[PDB]
Amino acid sequence: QFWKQLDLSSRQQVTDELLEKIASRSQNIIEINISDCRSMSDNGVCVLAFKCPGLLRYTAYRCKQLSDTSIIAVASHCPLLQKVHVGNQDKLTDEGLKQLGSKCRELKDIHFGQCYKISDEGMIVIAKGCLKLQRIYMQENKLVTDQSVKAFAEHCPELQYVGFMGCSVTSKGVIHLTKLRNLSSLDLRHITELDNETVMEIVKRCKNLSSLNLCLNWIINDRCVEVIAKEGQNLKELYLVSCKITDYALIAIGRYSMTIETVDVGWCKEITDQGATLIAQSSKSLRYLGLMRCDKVNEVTVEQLVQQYPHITFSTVLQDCKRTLERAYQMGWT
């Protein structure tokens, strides 16, 4: 009973050919965690998957020693899988992703961040089956295009989390996301083209959006923010960083929206004062106004406004005293 939750992460040289002994004596393990591993080879999972027919939560973040044969054994021996979270595991190809979508039609959460061999051929097959999908996450995986965002919104109608940061998706494949009526959060950072029209007609249709992570998208303008502000009923997290918005999105998102708690206008070359002093004065709800690297913001301004508005928490370069406020537990430095 104390087993079944292996969690052997950060055990670099203490995880040798021992998973067989942790499997023979303790069966029916439903969750494994071998992230940040460096000892076992793929014949250390090709032996445990043959002894654990009831895995549910495989997680292997940042283990570059593994290959496709790990997945081709985890999916070929576990016909009831609910979570595959691999991370920077470059070596994984599309000849192991097909057997993860043609033999495990129970997957509900996947994560393929930074595996620069994952094309849309495997993504189409993982979406053909695996109809019970809820969360998806991809880091800057190139060779993944609009042909994989146009097959993940047709054969997967229960998607709640969508992440396509740094991918090669265009706005023509992003507009095919208004058909997920159950969408909750978006993670569209640093893509080839997000236009301005599609962003408004994703918050005009998906009335369950609580997060919108569009960041490092220079084309996005100010009017888009006020459209989002007026037409977002469940939004609570807006993250506009390095976008081309000029000190009026602040008043818009704080005067025309009833639900908001976190806004991150940050590293924007044009954020003059009166912006943080109007959004704070006008907003009915605001728990975070992270500014950071806004070189047109005065420290007297957001110190005399920090004191005046205890409810809101701010984030500037000067807010390193909060990190050097955890020395109230150890101290012993100077």
Binding site: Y61, R62, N88, Q114, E140, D187, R189, H190, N213, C215, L216, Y239, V241, S242, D264, G266, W267, G290, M292, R293, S315, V317, L318, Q319, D320, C321, K322, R323, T324, E326, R327, Q330, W333, T334
Partner: protein
């Protein structure tokens, strides 16, 4: 001022205690704080603010070199850069890749232009 603050987290990092973010560069793990990197680079702010809590890991891409990222973390803390002609090109490559705004280029590499001409 602002200093004497960053100095404290520099002393923490140098002794490997109370560190939040771990950076992976060609295998080697480098420890750093959150706010320092968020103020240093937009490429770090974007990937830091989204996630949320205790232990955050950022793996920089291939073209980043351990001899180019060994500096610029010094620079983020101490506010000075080490410029040895044995290794300047990779430092500038990592600078332009990570898009650090604190360091200019036409005012920085013009020394080589003047020396060559």
């Amino acid at each position: 001022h602002s200093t004497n603050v960053l100095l404290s987290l520099n002393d923490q990092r140098k002794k490997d205690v109370l560190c939040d973010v771990t950076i992976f560069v060609e295998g080697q793990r480098f420890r750093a704080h959150r706010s320092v990197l968020a103020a240093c680079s937009s490429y770090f702010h974007s990937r830091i603010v989204g996630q949320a809590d205790g232990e955050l890991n950022i793996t920089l891409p291939e073209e980043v070199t351990v001899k180019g990222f060994e500096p610029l973390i010094q620079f983020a803390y101490t506010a000075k850069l080490i410029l040895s002609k044995e290794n300047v090109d990779e430092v500038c490559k990592c600078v332009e890749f990570l898009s650090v705004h604190n360091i200019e280029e036409s005012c920085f590499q013009f020394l080589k232009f003047k020396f060559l001409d």
